[PDB]
Design a binder for this molecule. Structure first.
Ligand SMILES: COc1ccc(CCc2nc3cc(-c4c(C)noc4C)ccc3n2CCN2CCOCC2)cc1
Length: 115
C-alpha cells in the first residue's frame, strides 16, 4: 500500500500529541539529548541513533516516513535509547516507562486502521 505523507501525518500525529501531553514525563524527550550541555560525552558512543519527540514530529511534518511501522520503530528507538543509557533509578528512565505505557494505549487503534 502507498502511504501518502498527509495521511500518515493526520493518522499518526494524535499518538505523538499524547506523548507531548505527558508532564513531567515528556519534558526530557521534547528536544534532542544535548551531550554538551548535559556534560555526558559518552552519550553518542552508547546511543548510535538518537531520537526524540521533536525529530519524530519533524519526520512526520516533512514526509520522511514512507510507511507507518517506521514511525512506531522511531518511537521505540527513542524508548530503547533512554532505557539503554540511563540508570533504572533515574527520572528519564521512569519517565520513558510512562511514555511507553501511553504510546502502547494510543498506537494500537491507529495501526489497526492504517495497515
Ligand atoms: C523533567 O525531567 C527532568 C529530567 C532531568 C533533568 C536534568 C537535566 C536533563 N537531564 C536530561 C537527560 C536527557 C536524556 C534522555 C531523554 N535520554 O538520555 C538522556 C541523558 C534529556 C534531557 C535532559 N535534561 C534536560 C531536561 N529539560 C527539562 C525541561 O525542558 C528542557 C529539557 C531535568 C528535568
Amino acid at each position: 500500500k502507498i502511504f501518502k505523507p498527509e495521511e500518515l501525518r493526520q493518522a499518526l500525529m494524535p499518538t505523538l500529541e499524547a506523548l507531548y501531553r505527558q508532564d513531567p514525563e515528556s519534558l526530557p524527550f521534547r528536544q534532542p539529548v544535548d551531550p554538551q550541555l548535559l556534560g555526558i560525552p559518552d552519550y553518542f558512543d552508547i546511543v548510535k541513533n538518537p531520537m526524540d519527540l521533536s525529530t519524530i514530529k519533524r519526520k512526520l511534518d516533512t514526509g520522511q516516513y514512507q510507511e507507518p511501522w517506521q514511525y512506531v520503530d522511531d518511537v521505540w528507538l527513542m524508548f530503547n535509547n533512554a532505557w539503554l543509557y540511563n540508570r533504572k533509578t533515574s527520572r528519564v528512565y521512569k519517565f520513558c516507562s510512562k511514555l511507553a505505557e501511553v504510546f502502547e494505549q494510543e498506537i494500537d487503534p491507529v495501526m489497526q486502521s492504517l495497515g
